[PDB]
Amino acid sequence: SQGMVGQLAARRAAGVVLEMIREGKIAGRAVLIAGQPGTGKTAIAMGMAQALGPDTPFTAIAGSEIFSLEMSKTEALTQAFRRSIGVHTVSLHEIDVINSREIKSEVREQINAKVAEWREEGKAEIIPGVLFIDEVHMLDIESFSFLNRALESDMAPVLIMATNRGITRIRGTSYQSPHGIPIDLLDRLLIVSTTPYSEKDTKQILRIRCEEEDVEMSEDAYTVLTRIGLETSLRYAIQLITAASLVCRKRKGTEVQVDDIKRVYSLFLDESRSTQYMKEYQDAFLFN
Amino acid sequence: SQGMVGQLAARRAAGVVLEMIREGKIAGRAVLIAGQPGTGKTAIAMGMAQALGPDTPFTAIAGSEIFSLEMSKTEALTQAFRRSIHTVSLHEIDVINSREIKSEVREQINAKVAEWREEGKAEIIPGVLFIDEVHMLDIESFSFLNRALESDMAPVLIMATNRGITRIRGTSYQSPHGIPIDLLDRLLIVSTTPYSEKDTKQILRIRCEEEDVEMSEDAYTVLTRIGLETSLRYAIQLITAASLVCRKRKGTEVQVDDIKRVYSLFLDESRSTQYMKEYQDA
Amino acid sequence: SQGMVGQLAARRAAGVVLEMIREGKIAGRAVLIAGQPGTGKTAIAMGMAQALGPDTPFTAIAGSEIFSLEMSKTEALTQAFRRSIGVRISLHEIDVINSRTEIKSEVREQINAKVAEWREEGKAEIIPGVLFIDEVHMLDIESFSFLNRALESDMAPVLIMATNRGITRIRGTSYQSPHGIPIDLLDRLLIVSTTPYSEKDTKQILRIRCEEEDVEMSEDAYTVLTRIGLETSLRYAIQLITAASLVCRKRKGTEVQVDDIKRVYSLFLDESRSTQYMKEYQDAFLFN
Amino acid sequence: VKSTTKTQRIASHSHVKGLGLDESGLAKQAASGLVGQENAREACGVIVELIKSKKMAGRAVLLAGPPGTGKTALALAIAQELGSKVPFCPMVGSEVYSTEIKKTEVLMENFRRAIGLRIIQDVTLHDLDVANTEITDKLRGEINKVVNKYIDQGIAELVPGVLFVDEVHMLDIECFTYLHRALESSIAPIVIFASNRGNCVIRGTEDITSPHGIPLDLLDRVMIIRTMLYTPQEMKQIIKIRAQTEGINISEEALNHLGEIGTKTTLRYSVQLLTPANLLAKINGKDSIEKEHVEEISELFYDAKSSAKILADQQDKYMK
Amino acid sequence: MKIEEVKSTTKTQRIASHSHVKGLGLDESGLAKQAASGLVGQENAREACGVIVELIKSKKMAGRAVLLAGPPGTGKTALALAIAQELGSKVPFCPMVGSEVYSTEIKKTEVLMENFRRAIGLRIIIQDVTLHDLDVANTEITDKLRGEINKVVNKYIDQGIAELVPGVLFVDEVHMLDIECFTYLHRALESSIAPIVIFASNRGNCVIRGTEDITSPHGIPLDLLDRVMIIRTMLYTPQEMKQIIKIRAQTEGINISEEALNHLGEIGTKTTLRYSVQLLTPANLLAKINGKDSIEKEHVEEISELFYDAKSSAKILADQQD
Amino acid sequence: EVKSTTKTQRIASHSHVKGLGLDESGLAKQAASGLVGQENAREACGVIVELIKSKKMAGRAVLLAGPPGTGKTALALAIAQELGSKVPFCPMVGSEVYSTEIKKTEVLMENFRRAIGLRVTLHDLDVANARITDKLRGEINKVVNKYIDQGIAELVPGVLFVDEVHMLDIECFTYLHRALESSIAPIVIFASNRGNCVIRGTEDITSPHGIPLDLLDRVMIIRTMLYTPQEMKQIIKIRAQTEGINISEEALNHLGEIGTKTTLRYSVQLLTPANLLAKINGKDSIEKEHVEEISELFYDAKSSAKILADQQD
Ligand SMILES: Nc1ncnc2c1ncn2[C@@H]1O[C@H](COP(=O)(O)OP(=O)(O)O)[C@@H](O)[C@H]1O
Ligand SMILES: Nc1ncnc2c1ncn2[C@@H]1O[C@H](COP(=O)(O)OP(=O)(O)O)[C@@H](O)[C@H]1O
Ligand SMILES: Nc1ncnc2c1ncn2[C@@H]1O[C@H](COP(=O)(O)OP(=O)(O)O)[C@@H](O)[C@H]1O
């Protein structure tokens, strides 16, 4: 249903989290979504945005997105929370570009007070959104400190963080913590675990994407491809499809045959074989 | 006597140093006092301040005190020497004429002082500076002292330390006491030895007197025994917390039972770490 | 002939490199003169300066001259290339003329554009020089990046680099390359290897240096002085002569004898014995 | 009054009203919310009487013990009983690292707030710092001269509060020196540190190893207190006290099963499964939380260590 | 915002070593030929690039990129050049090395934002022109000017007057770009005017530049490595390697005996193909000094004695030092 | 114009060094002009004195490698003695370059100017011509090249002693490499007691004595050897004489083993404090009793830290 396939564990757990959001009992927590890369961590976060409301704001910013020279880290994070709060309804960072034009920090606090008035007025009304920070172990203690100050606010959104890392050095210090998050915050997190896809789960996924890219396919070429997916990676299999049709439709086959999937699998490699060929050449060159 | 006890070696060695101070021969030297934490290094340094004169300026800055985000290191150290030299010191005069300090207002006061001093109106007397945990300082600050000791009005420097061979902070070389070798060839080094059992008892007997707290003879040998087992700093801590328990049950004066209770409640750094390294491994 | 002695391998290869300079085929390359210290790397480079021109500019700057207090690396390097570019009816020379105090990028493009006028004018003519950067492994990726932006130039001079190190971590990176040069540049270099001087080659050299201070010498002296030369360094033995004559002239001997060379060899040490003695003492107190 | 006191931090400590000691100074098994932990409870009782008897000149307090053993709770207890409306300021050590504000302004703002004046209007030194633009050190000395004057005039009394600095091993060598210098003054509050780490390299020196990550300059002015882990039988008693204060009905067996998670992970985790467990019961239309629920949450949500256990252990076989 | 087809910068030295590469030389259904349009061998990879040519024309390359992994001296700049040739009609090609972004006199974001604009051209009674030229015609580079020219250039296509020919951006030594450079690209590859990015790398599992615990394939981040299509290149056979050299000599006008390729080929098998190809010119000039038309095996054995490859020369100095 | 604020406090331990005590031949007398023993190195300095007088020291320096407390400064001070009357000598330690209130190039370029004098040092001509900056450096030198042209006043270059050379970073060496090229430079005498050291500021390059190879080549190295107990007593006997300290014959023997145990710098330092302790007991001279005590009271540096580490155990 709605593009979910399997992942019943996280889907259920995500369900529970909505209730503490609806019941107003989420204040001073967060959600962390732990699991291998490309196991629908984004989707489960996208899901909660949808199911929670018709106009709920949503923002998807990665960890490594903050290390850019565009502005400070604080400006980048501040702009994120400001965007992920809706008040037709338009977000607070949307309002900042009108009533400003960088932004003077005075402009922000200026708009804030005016908004507490119209909200209190009973003409304007506030709704929290959802912020999603992928790859969270990239952030550092100077940015984690900002979040705890940010969650303490009354109009704060719900924060959801994802990661695919176990015990790791907290970026910015010399200590190790689970998920590279400071321990002051991990005791407030609700951790939700996503497991890798099964065999049948994988097949269903490709079959959905083929529909999305209008590509005919044989049941043999469908299950020969799913086999690849479980052996290497799901984001590889999905890569091959569009490239597979263009070989089949080259010879005007139209319905993809196993020959093409055997062929195009031999032409574009995946990151595993790419390294191992490099690694082999590296060491034989180091030989003598 | 300044209620000195024990330290028979360092006390005498300190005595010899006063003569080269009085004979005008301490110029181009300094005093280093090596020894374990809590063996009267500040006291022995406080002693020489006393015996050298009734009004000698004395200054206590620790080594790590220079790491201030308020001021740079040079102000931190300059304000030390200026502070350590009716009668008043330069740094106290520095704030009046500087009604942070302007760099010109110091050199200004120096010229004005060279007149009144050479005049025969005022007299300058050097004091004593004490820099505890000197290994914290770095080569950027050691360079300053050597330039600072060259002045005619400079005080005598007394540096304490409880470390052996150590990396000179700011470089990649290991030097004794973390001091550069250009400076150790000028220092007079004095070693302070740990206290015996008898020496310990007399110390704790004085501080109970200092705070108006009685004790039984058993308590002293117990409390002194704790002193030798853990640290004199810890034992001296237990007393005030000891009296408040003895006075709790309306006892007159502290007994062994109360040293028992106040012991099992408050802990020292040795037991505190082991009763937590057991959890750390697990 | 012409002062060069031995180095018969590099002398010939240096000869070929002139031809790619004369035939206009050096563009987009450079010369690296690899070889242990004190094997005439500067000489063979200076030979190309002599052999190529009557007025050819020449600059001898080490790598460590770039790490200076009173200018950026770009400033110091840029002034080198400016100076080593000849012009007559060098660019850095004119820059104190058409400027007056500092030189600016806008000032430079001015004189460069004006020079594009007088060159094609037919009246003024430009001729490239030779830049010699000894101790090249000192440079970093910020300086190598500048060279690749420099050698592409239309009046760029020929770059000659020296070095006495094998693999090195490129200063500025976490990566190791042969000769401490980035791999993007080493595929554009012509490498010449210089071999250490033979015995007869050494003796001939000293005989030239002695002549320069009108210092006369006995035959056994040369034979003994060469032995120290091959044993320690050509750059050491040449140091002893000047000092040697002053002992001979001290006893009005008129001509250096082995007693003097045996004497002054006993008074002034060399870097080998110097360290050994330090390292012997360095250990004993360290033992305790 | 600026009414800026935080509440979402102390939310997990609403039940703690006192230290629960008899007149003599021996702990009762449970009173004023606290349960067990008698040794530390008795020790805090002594610390209470040195603060009132003015014997705590300069000294601080350290609560060394494993996480989830009542460190913050004991600190909060002392403040309420010691005086009416005495301020409590919890802070984690990692709050000093912020880009938009200097370290000194982080420590001082909490330090000033922990102190209040009883004129009658009770207000914290920090409200007078925001009542009297930007607040610099010149402004603080002035208020202390105008506040030390009011109390001396009988008009108001100074009630010093509690400053709880959790994760002390994260404050660098510069923050401590800023504390040590302030801890000697007379208007400061009582500083209570807390640590669950043994000997650690003092943040900012890369060579010094001192206990708990504190300098020896300041470590000789601290009174250490240990806390021991809670027993399975005490563990179940604490959670029942939180389930009540939340107005949550829990089954007797499930209170046992939730207690064992306490022994497995931490007391802070087991308590945090109450709320989500309750909502899962509302989904199935129940009043109380039955064992099915707690067995359900305990398989949906994960404690921190086990999750990284899964991923890292999957990571050896995931990549080769 | 004037159009300047004439005003341009072309690095002669970079095209010169691939002057012979005219087309990917694919025919039929993309089947490779042993020798076609200058290329030789590399049949596996040549066939694949033929597919990428189609994905680009059929507009399927939605935010994808290309990675050519393989040992150095295997035809990786050549193939990426041919793809630019095969898209046809003088599409831009901007070869750059990863280590160029570290420059002191210019920010990293400018060095990349620049090289992209050189690779997207606009064929607009008509004269082609690159987006960078419309910036230089637009002495200040601003983030406002960017979107303006993106609206001005894309208002012309949207008027139907203008057609956009996006070219190829070849970034070699990709493992030398730090994170901030990859995240700059990562948004630029999202745009609709962007060119094709063709990365290239010969290292293996490389840690991202900076103090990063992450170990990533080819030193690329994981977020960007997902939008990459990897193609492998294989080492050249002695026999193929000769047929490469014979083509460079023909393009330089150099007459060389058979035994001179048989020997010059083997040195390629030992060191690289880039080293062997470089020896042609210096061999020829020495062949002129001895007054011969063609290069005899004596000249290759001679140059081989004078000039060294970096991988051996450094080996000598370290060991003779030791 | 001159306050002459020269480091007298620094040279106070060298008052007895009058010259190199050279003999008529290249050999020098076993004991003369204050110095004692260390003959081999003394003779070499005799050669360095000639190359300076014969103007052959163009570009070169001197390196005095040897263990600590073997008479490095004393020779370097003596060399300034032999080069005429009242020639500048500016002893500086290498770690003085690291300063907060001053650029490294200042305090180096400054000591260099303090050491070249006229007939009045070139550093005096910057405070006297002060706005001392690099613009004014290039001006008074040519403004003084003119005076030698006129013969009004003659330039005598002095000696510069840079101790602890291994503490100067790669930037300082490149600076001296420049100014040692100019024609108004003094004789730079480095001193080091360490073998191969990573050149400060490079973290990978190892060179002899911590000196870069470009500068390590224009250097003439001279080794000094440790003193015998025999000779070491004579030096301590010489310092006592110059300080008016009567010392017992037995004490010099007990004060000569303590030297060879630790250093010569240490034993010379124990004289003054030993004397005052004898004044306490109202003695004319220093008896063995005293040195038996000061050896107990004060400690040499390495032994003190030796004790504290063992107390760490
Ligand atoms: N002695 C106690 N009696 C009852 N509840 C307690 C006691 N100590 C702690 N708690 C509660 O247990 C939970 C976790 O303990 P907490 O004090 O927060 O851990 P930490 O030890 O790291 O500070 C909180 O709900 C807290 O209020
Ligand atoms: N298949 C080929 N066809 C034609 N020329 C080739 C072929 N393979 C390599 N070359 C030539 O070899 C040289 C190296 O190009 P390339 O291999 O891309 O450099 P790199 O190997 O470092 O990527 C160029 O001359 C290129 O044209
Ligand atoms: N040859 C000598 N004869 C007499 N006294 C000497 C001699 N050499 C050094 N001294 C004295 O011994 C001490 C050693 O100083 P010195 O070792 O020269 O400096 P450094 O330790 O830096 O090398 C000084 O008091 C010096 O004057």
CATH number where A258 lies: 1.10.8.60
How many Å is the maximal CA-CA distance in chain C? 79
Residues 6+ apart with CB under 8 A from B35: B10, B41, B160, B162, B191, B192, B193, B194, F308
The answer to whether the CB of E171 falls within 8 A of the CB of E96 is yes
Best mutation target, D217, D230, D305, to test chain B (most B CBs within 10 A): D217
The structure tokens 């170990």 sit at: E215
Is residue E276 a contact partner of residue E241, using CB atoms and an 8 Å limit?
yes
CB E282 within 8 A of CB C20: yes
Across-strand partners of A91?
A86
* Partner-chain contact B279 D177, CB within 8 Å: no
* Experimental technique of record: cryo-EM
Q: Which residues of B touch F7 (CB under 8 A)?
A: 150
The number of the ligand 1 atom at minimal distance from the alpha carbon of D37 is: 1
A13, A184, A186 member nearest D167 (Cβ): A184
Do the beta carbons of residue A170 and residue D167 sit within 8 Å? no
Neighbours of B108 (CB within 10 A): 14
Return the CA Rg of chain B: 23
Q: Which amino acid is it at D220?
A: D
The torsion angles phi and psi of F279, rounded to 5 degrees, stand at -65, -30
Nearest CA in chain A to E108: A69
The residue with tokens 């009540």 is: D244
Using CA atoms, how far apart are residues D87 and D108, in angstroms rounded to an integer? 15
Q: Are residues A102 and A210 in the same domain?
A: no
Residue nearest to atom 6 of ligand 2 (CA): E75
- Which subunits sit against B, judged by 3+ Cβ pairs under 8 A? D, F
Q: Output phi, psi for B184, to 5 deg.
A: -65, -20
B189 and B201, same domain (yes or no): no
Q: Which of F9, F298, F312 sits opposite B189 (nearest CB)?
A: F298
User: What is the bridge-based pairing of β-strands D209-211 and D34-35?
Assistant: unpaired
CATH pick for D4-113+132-229 out of 3.40.50.300, 3.40.50.2000, 1.10.3720.10, 3.30.460.10: 3.40.50.300
Chain A positions in Cβ-Cβ contact with residue D100 (cut-off 8 Å): 74, 146
Asked if A96 and A107 touch (Cβ cutoff 8 Å), the reply is yes
**Chain-chain contact of C268 with F104 (C-beta, under 8 angstroms):** no
Backbone gaps in chain D, preceding residues (C–N over 2.5 A): 119, 132
List, in sequence order, every beta strand (DSSP E) within E192-270. Answer: 196-201, 205-207, 215-217, 228-232
Q: Which of E13, E14, E15, E18 to mutate to test the pocket of ligand 2 (most atoms within 8 A of CB)?
A: E18
The helix-helix angle for B256-265 and B232-246 (nearest 10°) equals 110
Give the helix/strand (H/E) hosting A58. Answer: strand A58-62
Same domain? A222 vs A275:
yes
Length of chain D: 320
Q: How far is C220 from chain F (nearest CA, A)?
A: 23
- Residue D174: partners with Cβ closer than 8 Å, 6 or more residues away: B67, B68, B69, D103, D204
Q: Are residues A110 and A189 in the same domain?
A: yes
Are residues B123 and B172 both part of a single domain? yes
Q: Which residues fall within 8 angstroms of residue F179, CB to CB, at 6 or more apart?
A: F109, F112, F185
CA distance E51 to A268: 10
Query: Of the candidates C181, C197, C213, which is a domain's last residue?
Result: C197
Domain with B242, as residue range(s), is: 196-282
CA distance E299 to E302: 5
Q: What is the CATH number of domain F227-310?
A: 1.10.8.60
**E184 Cα distance to chain centroid:** 21
User: Does CATH place domain E9-118+138-235 in 3.60.10.10?
Assistant: no
B3 and B94 share one domain: yes
CA distances from D282 to A25, D242, D276 (A): 14, 18, 10
* Residue with CA closest to ligand 1 atom 11: D70
A2 contact partners, CB below 8 Å, separation of at least 6: A47, A50
Mapping DSSP onto H, E and C, the string for C119-164 reads HHHCCCEEEECEEEEECHHHCCHHHHHHHHHHCCCCCCCEEEEEEC
Interchain touch D–B (≥3 Cβ pairs closer than 8 Å): yes
CATH architecture, domain E236-319: Orthogonal Bundle (1.10)
> For residue A192, which of D295, D303, D314 has the smallest C-alpha distance?
D303
Q: Which residues pair with A32 in a beta bridge?
A: A161, A191
Is the CB of residue D239 below 6 angstroms from any atom belonging to ligand 1?
no
Contact in structure between C83 and C130 (CB atoms under 8 Å): no
Test C243 with F47 for CB contact under 8 angstroms.
yes
Regarding whether A133 and A16 lie in a shared domain, the answer is yes
Question: Quick one: B7 and B126 in the same domain?
Answer: yes
By the 10 Å C-beta count (0-12 exposed, 13-18 middle, 19+ buried), F242 is classed as: exposed
Q: Which residues contact D206 (CB under 8 A, 6 or more apart)?
A: none
* Structural contact between residues A35 and A108, judged by C-beta atoms closer than 8 angstroms: no
The residues that bridge with C62 in the sheet, in sequence order, are C134
**Which CATH number does the domain housing residue B45 bear?**
3.40.50.300
C-alpha distances in angstroms, B185 versus B23, B31, B189, F261, F266? 21, 11, 10, 15, 7
Work out how many domains chain A is built from and give that number: 2
Radius of gyration for chain A, computed over Cα atoms and rounded to the nearest angstrom? 23
**Crossing angle of the two packed helices E43-57 and A258-267, in degrees rounded to 10:** 110
- Of C169, C197, C225, the residue that ends a domain is C197
Place of tokens 């961590």: A41
Residue F193's contacts (CB-CB under 8 Å, 6 or more residues apart) are C278, F65, F66, F67, F68
The secondary structure element, H or E, covering residue C176 is strand C176-178
- Residue A95, judged by CB atoms within 10 A of its CB (0-12, 13-18, 19+), counts as middle
F158 annotated binding-site participant: no
CA-based torsion, F153, F155, F156, F162: positive or negative: positive
Kindly provide the resolution of this structure in angstroms, with one decimal.
4.1
Around ligand 2, the residues with Cβ closer than 6 Å are E 17-18, 21, 38-42, 72-78, 244, 273-274, 277
Q: Nearest-CA residue of chain A relative to E43?
A: A267
Q: Is E76 annotated as a binding residue?
A: yes
Give the closest of C27, C144, C190 to E13, CB-based: C27
In chain D, the largest separation of any two C-alpha atoms, in whole Å, equals 77
Q: Cite the annotated binding site of B by residue number.
A: 35-42
Residues A150, A221, single domain; the answer is no
Residue pairs between chains A and E whose CB atoms are closer than 8 Å: 87
Beta-carbon contacts of C228 under 8 Å, excluding residues fewer than 6 positions away, are: C236, C237, C240, C261, C265
Residue A210 and residue A248 in one domain: yes
**Three-class SS state of E209:** strand
- State whether B161 and B203 are in the same domain: no
Select the residue of F163, F272, F294 nearest B25 (Cβ to Cβ). Answer: F272
Strand order in the sheet with D122-124: D122-124, D115-118, D157-160
Cβ atoms of A129 and A49 within 8 Å: the answer is yes
CATH class of D230-313: mainly alpha
Which position has the token pair 């990675």? E67
DSSP state of E11: -
Which three-class secondary structure string do you get for chain D?
A: CCCCCCCCCHHHHCCCCCCCECCCCCECCEECCEECCHHHHHHHHHHHHHHHCCCCCCCEEEEECCCCCCHHHHHHHHHHHHCCCCCEEEEEHHHCCCCCCCHHHHHHHHHHHCEEEECCCEEEHHHHHHHCCCCCHHHHHHHHHHHHHHHHCCCCEEEECEEEEECHHHCCHHHHHHHHHHHCCCCCCEEEEEECCCEEECCCCCCCEEECCCCHHHHCCEEEEECCCCCHHHHHHHHHHHHHHCCCEECHHHHHHHHHHHHHCCHHHHHHCHHHHHHHHHHCCCCEECHHHHHHHHHHEECHHHHHHHHHHHHHHHCC
Q: Residue for token digits 């040279």?
A: F11
* HEC letters along E32-76: ECCEECCEECCHHHHHHHHHHHHHHHCCCCCCCEEEEECCCCCCC
Residue D144: other Cβ atoms inside 10 A: 15
Measured between its terminal Cα atoms, the distance across chain C in Å is 58
Q: Is A268 left (phi over 0), alpha (psi -120 to 50) or beta?
A: beta
Chain C residues with beta carbon closer than 8 angstroms to that of F67: 281
Two domains, one topology: D4-113+132-229 and D230-313: no
Whether A contacts E, i.e. 3 or more CB pairs less than 8 A apart, is yes
Q: Which residues pair with C158 in a beta bridge?
A: C130
Identify the residue whose tokens are 């209570």: D192
CATH class held by domain F5-114+129-226: alpha beta
Give ligand 3 pocket residues (Cβ under 6 A). F 13-14, 35-36, 38, 68-74, 163, 235, 238, 264-265, 268
Is the Cα torsion angle D248, D254, D259, D260 positive or negative in sign?
negative
Same domain, B110 and B45: yes
